[PDB]
Amino acid sequence: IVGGTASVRGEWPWQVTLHTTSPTQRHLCGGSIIGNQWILTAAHCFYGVESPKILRVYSGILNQSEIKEDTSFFGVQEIIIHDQYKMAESGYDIALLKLETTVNYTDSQRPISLPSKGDRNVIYTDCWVTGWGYRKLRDKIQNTLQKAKIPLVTNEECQKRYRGHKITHKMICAGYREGGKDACKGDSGGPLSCKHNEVWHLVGITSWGEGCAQRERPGVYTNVVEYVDWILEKTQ
Numbered sequence: 709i710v711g712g713t714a715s716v717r718g719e720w721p722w723q724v725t726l727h728t729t730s731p732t733q734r735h736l737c738g739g740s741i742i743g744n745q746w747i748l749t750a751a752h753c754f755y756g757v758e759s760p761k762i763l764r765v766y767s768g769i770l771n772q773s774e775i776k777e778d779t780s781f782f783g784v785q786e787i788i789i790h791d792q793y794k795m796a797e798s799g800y801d802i803a804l805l806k807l808e809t810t811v812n813y814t815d816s817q818r819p820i821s822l823p824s825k826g827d828r829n830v831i832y833t834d835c836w837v838t839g840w841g842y843r844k845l846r847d848k849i850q851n852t853l854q855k856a857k858i859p860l861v862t863n864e865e866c867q868k869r870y871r872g873h874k875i876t877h878k879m880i881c882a883g884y885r886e887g888g889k890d891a892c893k894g895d896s897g898g899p900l901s902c903k904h905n906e907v908w909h910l911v912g913i914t915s916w917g918e919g920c921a922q923r924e925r926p927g928v929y930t931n932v933v934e935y936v937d938w939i940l941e942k943t944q
């Protein structure tokens with residue numbers, strides 16, 4: 709996350725770090741706990757992943773440096789990628805991980821709610837992007853979970869800035885007109901969480917952007933409310 713600020717333990721308890729272990733262990737992507745056995749994340753996270761065997765999901769993590777070889781994790785039983793996914797920029801950048809076991813929820817691992825039935829027309833004014841990605845275009849995975857508050861831009865404005873892509877109703881955009889704060893490399897799959905009536909909703913999934921925190925170039929996210937039927941279909 710560019711222009712962001714460090715988080716404290718317990719603060720984003722739905723944020724997971726998804727690790728690949730092939731050929732060596734490293735943070736691959738972020739993700740959100742949406743069910744006891746279910747993580748929501750981005751499809752482009754699995755571009756080089758041979759199978760779920762190599763994946764570890766860590767929850768309750770503030771610092772990447774807490775992950776030692778005795779640190780508990782959740783195996784991934786399944787990666788359900790949307791059948792229409794091809795590449796991030798062309799939408800459908802959504803994926804569920806079915807964990808091998810049920811997360812017992814604690815102070816440090818909690819579910820984030822999906823956007824709610826009847827809230828299609830809520831205007832979300834308190835939205836945050838979280839993750840351990842870069843702080844600039846050429847940087848490194850950060851040790852401490854970063855956070856930045858970012859305003860939603862309308863899909864009409866978002867199309868004016870990305871006239872070489874098709875920005876659809878199944879995408880949601882978020883960024884400052886003068887840049888400065890945004891997601892970046894390694895933040896993919898993570899949440900754009902928004903609080904409405906003091907409840908947090910999983911509004912977005914970090915997908916793609918032209919550079920990081922560039923002015924007039926907003927972050928583009930998978931619009932989760934448009935995939936709720938898909939999510940339920942697949943999680944039932």
Ligand SMILES: O=C1CSc2cc(C(=O)N[C@@H](Cc3ccccc3)C(=O)NCCc3cc(Cl)ccc3-n3cnnn3)ccc2N1
Nearest residue numbers: 734735736753891892893894895896915916917919927928
């Ligand atoms: O130990 C390491 C070495 S550094 C590292 C980088 C990435 C990475 O490139 N992630 C990409 C996604 C990706 C996943 C799999 C294969 C290839 C790429 C990403 O986050 N991409 C984030 C996309 C993005 C989203 C928004 Cl909302 C705004 C701006 C950006 N931009 C970041 N860079 N340019 N734009 C993932 C894990 C990593 N762990």
